[PDB]
Amino acid sequence: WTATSGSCKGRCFELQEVGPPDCRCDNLCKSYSSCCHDFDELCLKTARGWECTKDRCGEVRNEENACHCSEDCLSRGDCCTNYQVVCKGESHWVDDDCEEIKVPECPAGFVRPPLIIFSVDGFRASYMKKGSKVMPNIEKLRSCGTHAPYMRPVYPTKTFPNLYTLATGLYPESHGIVGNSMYDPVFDASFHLRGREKFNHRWWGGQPLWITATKQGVRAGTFFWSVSIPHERRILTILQWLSLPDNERPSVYAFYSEQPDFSGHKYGPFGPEMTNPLREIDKTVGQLMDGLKQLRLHRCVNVIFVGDHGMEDVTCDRTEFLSNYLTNVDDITLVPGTLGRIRAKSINNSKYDPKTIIAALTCKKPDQHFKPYMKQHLPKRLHYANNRRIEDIHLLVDRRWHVARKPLDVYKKCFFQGDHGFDNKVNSMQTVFVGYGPTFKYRTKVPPFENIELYNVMCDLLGLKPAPNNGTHGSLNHLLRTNTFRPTMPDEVSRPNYPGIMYLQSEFDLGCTCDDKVENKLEELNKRLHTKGSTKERHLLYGRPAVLYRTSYDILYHTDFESGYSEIFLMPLWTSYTISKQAEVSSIPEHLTNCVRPDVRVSPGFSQNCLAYKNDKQMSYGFLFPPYLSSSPEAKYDAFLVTNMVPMYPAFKRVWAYFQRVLVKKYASERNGVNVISGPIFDYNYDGLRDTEDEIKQYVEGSSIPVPTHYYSIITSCLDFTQPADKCDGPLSVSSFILPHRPDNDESCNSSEDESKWVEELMKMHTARVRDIEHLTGLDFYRKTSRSYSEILTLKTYLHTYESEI
Ligand SMILES: *[C@@H]1O[C@H](CO)[C@@H](O[C@@H]2O[C@H](CO)[C@@H](O[C@@H]3O[C@H](CO[C@H]4O[C@H](CO)[C@@H](O)[C@H](O[C@H]5O[C@H](CO)[C@@H](O)[C@H](O)[C@@H]5O[C@H]5O[C@H](CO)[C@@H](O)[C@H](O)[C@@H]5O)[C@@H]4O)[C@@H](O)[C@H](O[C@H]4O[C@H](CO)[C@@H](O)[C@H](O)[C@@H]4O[C@H]4O[C@H](CO)[C@@H](O)[C@H](O)[C@@H]4O)[C@@H]3O)[C@H](O)[C@H]2NC(C)=O)[C@H](O)[C@H]1NC(C)=O
Ligand SMILES: O=C(NCC1(O)CCN(C(=O)OCc2ccc(OC(F)(F)F)c(F)c2)CC1)c1ccc2[nH]nnc2c1
Ligand SMILES: [Ca+2]
Ligand SMILES: [Ca+2]
Ligand SMILES: [Cl-]
Ligand SMILES: [K+]
Numbered sequence: 169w170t171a172t173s174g175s176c177k178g179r180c181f182e183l184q185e186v187g188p189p190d191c192r193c194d195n196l197c198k199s200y201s202s203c204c205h206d207f208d209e210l211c212l213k214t215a216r217g218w219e220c221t222k223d224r225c226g227e228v229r230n231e232e233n234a235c236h237c238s239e240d241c242l243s244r245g246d247c248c249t250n251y252q253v254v255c256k257g258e259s260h261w262v263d264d265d266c267e268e269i270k271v272p273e274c275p276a277g278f279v280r281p282p283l284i285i286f287s288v289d290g291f292r293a294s295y296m297k298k299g300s301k302v303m304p305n306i307e308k309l310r311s312c313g314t315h316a317p318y319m320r321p322v323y324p325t326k327t328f329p330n331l332y333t334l335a336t337g338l339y340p341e342s343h344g345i346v347g348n349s350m351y352d353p354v355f356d357a358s359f360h361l362r363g364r365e366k367f368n369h370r371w372w373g374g375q376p377l378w379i380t381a382t383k384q385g386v387r388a389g390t391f392f393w394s395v396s397i398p399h400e401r402r403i404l405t406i407l408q409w410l411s412l413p414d415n416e417r418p419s420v421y422a423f424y425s426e427q428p429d430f431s432g433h434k435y436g437p438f439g440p441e442m443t444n445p446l447r448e449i450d451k452t453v454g455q456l457m458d459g460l461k462q463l464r465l466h467r468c469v470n471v472i473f474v475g476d477h478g479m480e481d482v483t484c485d486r487t488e489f490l491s492n493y494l495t496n497v498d499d500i501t502l503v504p505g506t507l508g509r510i511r512a513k514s515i516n517n518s519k520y521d522p523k524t525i526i527a528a529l530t531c532k533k534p535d536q537h538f539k540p541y542m543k544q545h546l547p548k549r550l551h552y553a554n555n556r557r558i559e560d561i562h563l564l565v566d567r568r569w570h571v572a573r574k575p576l577d578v579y580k581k582c583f584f585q586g587d588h589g590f591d592n593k594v595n596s597m598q599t600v601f602v603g604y605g606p607t608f609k610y611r612t613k614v615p616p617f618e619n620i621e622l623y624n625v626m627c628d629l630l631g632l633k634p635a636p637n638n639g640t641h642g643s644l645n646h647l648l649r650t651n652t653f654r655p656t657m658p659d660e661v662s663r664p665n666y667p668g669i670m671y672l673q674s675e676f677d678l679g680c681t682c683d684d685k686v687e688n689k690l691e692e693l694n695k696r697l698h699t700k701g702s703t704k705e706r707h708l709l710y711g712r713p714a715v716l717y718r719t720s721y722d723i724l725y726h727t728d729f730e731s732g733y734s735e736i737f738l739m740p741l742w743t744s745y746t747i748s749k750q751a752e753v754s755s756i757p758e759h760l761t762n763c764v765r766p767d768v769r770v771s772p773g774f775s776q777n778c779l780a781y782k783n784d785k786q787m788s789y790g791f792l793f794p795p796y797l798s799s800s801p802e803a804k805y806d807a808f809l810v811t812n813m814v815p816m817y818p819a820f821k822r823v824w825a826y827f828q829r830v831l832v833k834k835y836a837s838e839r840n841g842v843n844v845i846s847g848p849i850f851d852y853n854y855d856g857l858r859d860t861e862d863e864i865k866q867y868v869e870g871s872s873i874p875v876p877t878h879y880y881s882i883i884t885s886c887l888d889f890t891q892p893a894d895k896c897d898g899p900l901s902v903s904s905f906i907l908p909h910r911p912d913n914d915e916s917c918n919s920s921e922d923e924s925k926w927v928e929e930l931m932k933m934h935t936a937r938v939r940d941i942e943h944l945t946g947l948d949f950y951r952k953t954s955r956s957y958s959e960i961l962t963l964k965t966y967l968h969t970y971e972s973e974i
């Protein structure tokens with residue numbers, strides 16, 4: 169209950185929300201049904217429209233008008249945004265030649281350039297090009313400021329997870345808004361789009377820009393607007409705020425548009441009805457920019473034009489029904505649509521089995537338009553698992569489709585022709601970024617980047633220190649003229665050992681054998697040099713990875729590869745090798761098929777053994793440097809050392825062998841040599857971070873050999889492919905993956921076919937940033953290049969997506 173019998177006189181869009189039950193006048197009061205009786209009368213004037221006509225010029229101030237054309241309006245701060253154009257012979261902002269903004273040009277009393285965030289819902293990336301004819305204002309920002317061809321949203325590509333990711337720099341799994349609709353088992357509460365529960369602060373984790381700004385003494389406009397408040401009024405409210413006295417004037421603001429998402433849902437992303445919403449949003453940008461010009465703020469304010477996600481073509485007839493797969497369909501709750509999340513309808517039903525449910529949804533129909541996963545098996549790039557609000561069972565839906573429980577759900581809710589929410593690598597889901605002002609660069613194109621990175625930059629722009637978040641601070645310095653953040657490389661925490669030959673073959677008792685008994689001076693001197701690292705500049709191109717946690721490991725050098733071998737985990741943390749364009753693929757000789765060789769540099773106590781693999785009927789093993797890419801028959805013996813061995817399910821060796829025997833060569837061929845760093849990942853608690861040893865849930869039977877949840881590779885080469893990988897002068901090029909180490913290939917529906925038909929597709933699905941791998945390994949890569957650190961950070965956030973062009 170609100171005692172709504174107070175007043176909004178002189179309080180319209182107050183910046184400090186008042187406490188119940190005195191009535192409110194803030195831009196959110198409508199949503200709380202708590203505005204004063206006179207809020208509409210006083211704060212939402214509409215009289216005479218939003219534009220000055222030639223005959224309103226010089227007029228006498230009539231307070232009933234929505235905006236003014238009187239002589240005193242400039243200094244009252246409440247002219248219609250086009251006042252100067254109509255009444256003072258000024259030009260619109262969009263008609264003006266664009267001019268570099270080298271320094272902020274601000275009125276006396278402005279301590280910093282204000283930031284204005286102009287956020288647009290459902291603004292698909294290709295709109296910039298495709299709708300350019302009807303968006304002159306937006307096109308001017310884009311082409312005159314700093315722009316990316318697109319920005320990558322987070323998964324799910326839904327509204328709240330993405331807006332709250334912009335605001336916080338955090339993955340939805342960390343911020344808590346993991347969908348538009350959520351159930352939290354601990355609260356025993358439900359969050360929905362429509363309703364009051366979403367206003368409860370317990371849903372919202374992390375620290376959004378407005379709170380960061382506030383705590384650090386930077387005043388913020390209130391970010392959120394009630395639906396009923398028309399765009400024109402929001403714009404005027406922002407401009408009014410910017411005329412306030414210095415001590416009361418906020419430094420950061422947000423505008424939000426419900427369009428083009430609203431129409432996109434009805435009409436599809438490119439429906440002819442979409443031209444009008446795009447014109448309208450442009451008109452609004454024009455109003456903003458014209459109003460900034462009027463206040464002499466158009467060369468002072470940094471403006472960000474940013475979308476939450478794109479829009480895809482989706483119709484009712486493209487719906488998969490869980491009733492066609494499950495007979496038990498009433499015992500489950502489905503969160504539906506462009507993603508699927510499944511839980512038990514009742515906690516008291518012990519006839520519920522996720523295992524049998526996944527199986528009943530796995531590869532059942534030839535053209536199946538979703539794939540079920542246990543959340544921990546989702547591609548690690550989605551970072552979508554570490555929250556009690558994310559159900560164990562998840563369905564990734566093909567672009568253009570929906571998933572629903574029963575057909576009755578669809579027709580007793582075709583209405584819609586567009587939707588969004590799919591995998592964040594999907595082209596149709598990509599969105600927009602433009603930065604324009606003194607702090608952003610002039611006429612500059614930057615590569616696509618992830619929306620998780622912007623929070624850092626908005627802090628940079630405002631002189632704020634960002635709260636801990638998922639961006640890599642410095643990775644977007646290239647967007648900025650100044651205000652850059654100069655990061656320093658994290659310090660190495662563990663230094664390696666360099667073991668020499670310390671053990672005799674007979675001290676090992678590992679149950680391993682090798683037919684290596686078939687045994688010069690020119691070449692004994694030679695292989696000695698190889699074990700001291702004579703070829704190390706070839707195979708270790710960027711320096712060694714730094715270990716950022718306390719542990720015990722050995723650098724091991726070889727002719728063809730170098731490794732950092734962990735005495736704690738009994739396997740390398742990383743194995744680094746270079747494969748030039750000219751390299752030859754050989755087979756494993758017949759005699760050496762089961763060959764494993766004790767490593768005379770490493771104690772038996774800190775080694776794996778063959779016996780455990782023999783006894784473990786589930787687990788086989790593979791190698792990190794592949795025997796197939798050995799440089800010579802004699803170097804091949806090195807690839808079979810017990811210290812190059814890692815545990816692998818037979819089902820995964822199919823994947824791994826095909827990568828090593830076929831794809832490394834192809835990449836060397838296509839990219840003019842590659843440098844490969846490969847290794848194991850342990851993430852049993854699926855938090856995207858390196859497990860400590862006491863977190864491993866699985867060992868090779870009867871041993872302390874820990875089983876990875878995943879295997880990674882970072883594959884680097886020269887961005888200028890006319891230069892070989894091992895002699896690159898300039899910028900680098902990288903693609904990486906984090907393949908799940910699974911006992912079956914259920915994920916890949918074509919897996920009973922030859923590896924050339926499915927392995928690569930699986931790998932592409934599990935593409936990753938080097939930065940994802942760093943989090944999962946406590947390693948820091950690219951420590952020694954000739955490249956600047958900021959450029960290396962960008963490189964480390966790059967994701968190779970395998971989508972066609974935008
Ligand atoms: C992306 O970036 C983010 C941001 O940096 C990364 O997330 C951080 O990671 C840290 C490491 O995991 C983690 O640090 C821990 O802090 C714990 C206290 O955290 C509270 O306070 C902070 C600060 O204000 C707050 O942000 C937290 O908010 C969480 O929880 C609320 C509700 O309670 C949510 O609303 C909110 O969304 C957020 O939830 C998310 O994080 C939690 C983890 O806290 C997840 O569980 C959720 O699923 C959700 O995703 C908290 O209110 C602190 O308790 C930890 O300390 C333990 O471990 C240390 C080791 O240093 C040890 O010294 C202690 O003994 C202690 O262990 C004790 O508890 C154990 C478990 O109960 C128990 O087994 C032991 O016996 C001990 O008693 C730890 O230091 C930090 O909280 C999060 N921050 C955020 C915002 O998410 C994220 O890693 C990045 N992701 C990637 C892939 O890089
Ligand atoms: O609009 C929808 N629902 C209503 C809504 O809550 C109204 C209030 N609101 C707002 O005014 O937000 C400003 C803002 C702008 C930017 C930010 O972040 C920042 F600042 F970082 F950009 C930031 F946190 C906040 C957000 C949207 C909606 C849309 C499309 C859909 N499709 N399917 N379902 C859907 C539901
Ligand atoms: Ca949205
Ligand atoms: Ca972990
Ligand atoms: Cl959702
Ligand atoms: K075995």
Ligand code: NA
Nearest residue numbers: 913914916919
């Ligand atoms: Na299969």
Ligand SMILES: [Zn+2]
Nearest residue numbers: 290429433588
């Ligand atoms: Zn939408």
